[PDB]
Amino acid sequence: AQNPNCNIMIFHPTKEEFNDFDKYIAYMESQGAHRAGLAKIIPPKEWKARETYDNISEILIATPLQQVASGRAGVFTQYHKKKKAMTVGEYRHLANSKKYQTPPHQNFEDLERKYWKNRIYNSPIYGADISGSLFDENTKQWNLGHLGTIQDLLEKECGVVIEGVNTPYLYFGMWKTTFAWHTEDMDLYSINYLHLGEPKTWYVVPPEHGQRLERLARELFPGSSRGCGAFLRHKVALISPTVLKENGIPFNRITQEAGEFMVTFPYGYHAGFNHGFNCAEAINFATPRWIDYGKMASQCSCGEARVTFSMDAFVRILQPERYDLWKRGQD
Ligand SMILES: O=C(O)CNC(=O)C(=O)O
Ligand SMILES: [Mg+2]
Ligand code: NI
Ligand SMILES: [Zn+2]
């Protein structure tokens, strides 16, 4: 078995290997990459996402989210308070202000220490989940707006044609902006490209050990667990590496820098934080190997998770027994 310790693997495809996206994902899996839940892909030196980032300031962040924490430093939830709209230029200025800017630090490890010590005492503002793309239309390789759609994959594998669409999302971050522990909708893959700015630190639990994280989460968030049998789908709970280690949960960590891709694999729980002002683009995707994960994915039916239009068909076709309860949660 390849990669039996479930380490995060880093790949350096050549320009020729960067042509065929599906083929390269299957290659990475042949080397055991998926066992970690997360892989890094460094593009060939010849590649670029677009020519420059000099003209992005007028993008609108219609609903910036202030991420307010509750709990203790290593075990907390966050809720998202909606703020007034602002442009990317306005948000960048805000991220760089004395109130929000990255503190002085020695290296990524020192910054990570500072994050976990101090995150809860601040409420950073995240421009998350903005439909759109920063890839140039002429970028033919690993262009996250030109991937094969999940609806087409389901139709290719299973023969059933379904409604729905699959488009990317932009994320504008600042210091301490946080992504809570989660797997993707329907335990899909994700791919995330860090277009510009400061790094993003990731934590990940191997898919084969995801239920260990779920059992810890139920212990640490016991009211939430009584409320919903899949409350990590709410995407609000944080648990620090120190607490994971104290409880014997297998995990790994890595820092993504600008110009790098990360892929999360089906049922790979992940969480993390941004180091300073940045912009990422991410989208969900599927492969043949996903289908079995999609059929077994947990679902939130309590009403909290509320998701896209296109998840309806995935539940309806892959999980018909669960469909009626899940759809009630959507309505
Ligand atoms: O970058 C973020 O805030 C969150 N991203 C992801 O969870 C992802 O790409 O799957
Ligand atoms: Mg602009
Ligand atoms: Ni994710
Ligand atoms: Zn729920």
Curated annotation (Swiss-Prot):
- GO BP, sorted A to Z: cellular response to ionizing radiation; chromatin remodeling; double-strand break repair via homologous recombination; inflammatory response; positive regulation of chromatin binding; positive regulation of double-strand break repair via nonhomologous end joining; regulation of gene expression; regulation of protein phosphorylation
Which compartment or compartments is the protein found in? Nucleus
The coding gene here is KDM4D
- Which positions in this protein are listed as binding Zn(2+)? C228, H234, C300, C302
- Sequence ranges assigned to domain JmjC in this UniProt record: 136-302
This protein's record includes keyword Transcription:
yes
Q: Which residues bind Fe cation?
A: H182, E184, H270
Described purpose of this protein according to its UniProt entry: Histone demethylase that specifically demethylates 'Lys-9' of histone H3, thereby playing a central role in histone code. Does not demethylate histone H3 'Lys-4', H3 'Lys-27', H3 'Lys-36' nor H4 'Lys-20'. Demethylates both di- and trimethylated H3 'Lys-9' residue, while it has no activity on monomethylated residues. Demethylation of Lys residue generates formaldehyde and succinate.
Q: Which GO terms describe its cellular component?
A: blood microparticle; chromatin; nucleoplasm; nucleus; pericentric heterochromatin; site of double-strand break
Question: What does it catalyze?
Answer: N(6),N(6),N(6)-trimethyl-L-lysyl(9)-[histone H3] + 2 2-oxoglutarate + 2 O2 = N(6)-methyl-L-lysyl(9)-[histone H3] + 2 formaldehyde + 2 succinate + 2 CO2
Post-translational modification summary for this protein:
Ubiquitinated via 'Lys-63'-linked ubiquitin chains. Deubiquitinated by USP14 with the help of TRIM14 leading to stabilization.
Tell me the protein's name.
Lysine-specific demethylase 4D
Q: Which residues bind 2-oxoglutarate?
A: Y126, N192, K200, K235
Family, as annotated: Belongs to the JHDM3 histone demethylase family.
Enzyme category, top tier: oxidoreductase
GO MF terms listed in the record are:
chromatin DNA binding; damaged DNA binding; histone demethylase activity; histone H3K9 demethylase activity; histone H3K9me2/H3K9me3 demethylase activity; metal ion binding
Note how many cofactor molecules are bound and how.
Binds 1 Fe(2+) ion per subunit.
Tell me its cofactors.
Answer: Fe(2+)
This enzyme's EC code(s) = 1.14.11.66
User: This protein's superkingdom?
Assistant: Eukaryota
